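FAQ: What does a ligand-bound record look like?

Like this one, built around 49H:
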Amino acid sequence: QINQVRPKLPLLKILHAAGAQGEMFTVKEVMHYLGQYIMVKQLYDQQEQHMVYCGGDLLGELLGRQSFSVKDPSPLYDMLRKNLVTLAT
Ligand SMILES: COc1ccc(C2=N[C@@H](c3cccc(Cl)c3)[C@@H](c3ccc(Cl)cc3)N2C(=O)N2CCNC(=O)C2)c(OC(C)C)c1
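The answer part, i.e. the structure of the complex:
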Protein backbone atom coordinates (compact mmCIF):
# COMPACT_ATOMS: atom_id res chain seq x y z
CA GLN A 1 0.00 0.00 0.00
CA ILE A 2 0.82 3.78 -0.13
CA ASN A 3 3.33 5.47 2.25
CA GLN A 4 0.48 7.03 4.33
CA VAL A 5 -2.67 5.84 6.27
CA ARG A 6 -5.89 3.84 5.41
CA PRO A 7 -8.74 2.67 7.82
CA LYS A 8 -11.05 -0.38 8.39
CA LEU A 9 -14.87 -0.26 7.70
CA PRO A 10 -16.19 1.25 11.06
CA LEU A 11 -13.33 3.84 11.01
CA LEU A 12 -13.77 4.57 7.22
CA LYS A 13 -17.41 5.43 8.23
CA ILE A 14 -16.14 8.39 10.33
CA LEU A 15 -14.29 10.13 7.45
CA HIS A 16 -17.27 9.18 5.15
CA ALA A 17 -19.51 11.23 7.54
CA ALA A 18 -17.26 14.20 6.47
CA GLY A 19 -17.52 13.37 2.68
CA ALA A 20 -14.01 11.76 2.49
CA GLN A 21 -12.84 8.20 1.43
CA GLY A 22 -11.51 7.01 4.83
CA GLU A 23 -7.98 7.96 6.10
CA MET A 24 -6.63 6.48 2.78
CA PHE A 25 -4.15 9.37 2.11
CA THR A 26 -1.32 11.61 3.58
CA VAL A 27 -1.26 13.57 6.93
CA LYS A 28 -2.29 16.83 5.17
CA GLU A 29 -5.35 15.16 3.59
CA VAL A 30 -6.55 13.39 6.82
CA MET A 31 -6.28 16.63 8.81
CA HIS A 32 -8.32 18.43 6.05
CA TYR A 33 -11.27 15.94 6.26
CA LEU A 34 -10.91 15.96 10.10
CA GLY A 35 -11.15 19.81 10.20
CA GLN A 36 -14.41 19.65 8.16
CA TYR A 37 -15.64 16.67 10.32
CA ILE A 38 -15.24 18.82 13.50
CA MET A 39 -16.87 21.78 11.65
CA VAL A 40 -20.00 19.66 10.70
CA LYS A 41 -20.12 17.62 13.98
CA GLN A 42 -19.63 20.97 15.87
CA LEU A 43 -17.80 19.17 18.72
CA TYR A 44 -16.37 22.42 20.28
CA ASP A 45 -16.98 25.07 23.00
CA GLN A 46 -19.23 28.09 22.19
CA GLN A 47 -16.62 30.67 23.39
CA GLU A 48 -13.70 28.76 21.71
CA GLN A 49 -14.13 26.79 18.45
CA HIS A 50 -10.33 26.17 18.86
CA MET A 51 -11.07 23.63 21.69
CA VAL A 52 -12.65 20.24 20.75
CA TYR A 53 -14.92 18.04 22.96
CA CYS A 54 -15.77 14.62 21.44
CA GLY A 55 -17.93 13.24 24.31
CA GLY A 56 -19.50 9.91 23.19
CA ASP A 57 -18.50 10.46 19.48
CA LEU A 58 -16.90 8.01 17.01
CA LEU A 59 -14.06 10.62 16.68
CA GLY A 60 -13.33 10.25 20.45
CA GLU A 61 -13.38 6.45 19.94
CA LEU A 62 -11.04 6.84 16.86
CA LEU A 63 -8.45 9.02 18.72
CA GLY A 64 -8.85 7.22 22.13
CA ARG A 65 -9.55 10.60 23.92
CA GLN A 66 -12.59 12.89 24.12
CA SER A 67 -10.69 16.23 23.92
CA PHE A 68 -7.93 18.09 21.97
CA SER A 69 -7.33 21.59 20.43
CA VAL A 70 -5.83 23.31 17.33
CA LYS A 71 -3.01 24.47 19.75
CA ASP A 72 -2.46 20.90 21.15
CA PRO A 73 -2.94 18.57 18.06
CA SER A 74 -0.66 15.75 19.50
CA PRO A 75 -3.66 13.26 19.60
CA LEU A 76 -3.58 13.28 15.73
CA TYR A 77 0.18 12.60 15.58
CA ASP A 78 -0.20 9.75 18.15
CA MET A 79 -2.76 8.28 15.65
CA LEU A 80 -0.26 8.78 12.72
CA ARG A 81 3.05 7.58 14.40
CA LYS A 82 1.50 4.08 14.60
CA ASN A 83 1.13 4.04 10.76
CA LEU A 84 4.13 6.13 9.42
CA VAL A 85 7.17 7.85 11.03
CA THR A 86 6.33 11.61 10.90
CA LEU A 87 6.38 14.91 12.90
CA ALA A 88 4.81 15.49 16.38
CA THR A 89 4.37 18.21 19.07
C1 LIG B 1 -10.78 29.64 16.69
O1 LIG B 1 -11.22 28.32 16.27
C2 LIG B 1 -10.60 27.61 15.26
C3 LIG B 1 -9.32 27.92 14.81
C4 LIG B 1 -8.76 27.20 13.76
C5 LIG B 1 -9.47 26.15 13.14
C6 LIG B 1 -8.81 25.49 11.96
N1 LIG B 1 -7.54 25.58 11.81
C7 LIG B 1 -7.08 24.57 10.82
C8 LIG B 1 -5.75 23.92 11.20
C9 LIG B 1 -4.70 23.89 10.28
C10 LIG B 1 -3.47 23.34 10.62
C11 LIG B 1 -3.28 22.78 11.88
C12 LIG B 1 -4.33 22.78 12.80
CL1 LIG B 1 -4.12 22.03 14.35
C13 LIG B 1 -5.55 23.37 12.47
C14 LIG B 1 -8.33 23.65 10.67
C15 LIG B 1 -8.26 22.33 11.45
C16 LIG B 1 -7.53 21.26 10.92
C17 LIG B 1 -7.40 20.07 11.63
C18 LIG B 1 -8.03 19.93 12.86
CL2 LIG B 1 -7.86 18.47 13.76
C19 LIG B 1 -8.78 20.97 13.39
C20 LIG B 1 -8.89 22.17 12.69
N2 LIG B 1 -9.42 24.53 11.11
C21 LIG B 1 -10.60 24.46 10.45
O2 LIG B 1 -10.99 23.40 10.01
N3 LIG B 1 -11.33 25.60 10.24
C22 LIG B 1 -12.68 25.49 9.63
C23 LIG B 1 -13.54 26.75 9.78
N4 LIG B 1 -12.82 27.95 9.35
C24 LIG B 1 -11.50 28.11 9.55
O3 LIG B 1 -10.97 29.13 9.15
C25 LIG B 1 -10.75 26.98 10.26
C26 LIG B 1 -10.73 25.81 13.65
O4 LIG B 1 -11.41 24.71 13.17
C27 LIG B 1 -12.43 23.97 13.88
C28 LIG B 1 -13.06 22.97 12.89
C29 LIG B 1 -11.81 23.23 15.08
C30 LIG B 1 -11.28 26.55 14.70
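Follow-up question: can I read anything off the structure? Yes, for example: The chain has four helices and three strands.
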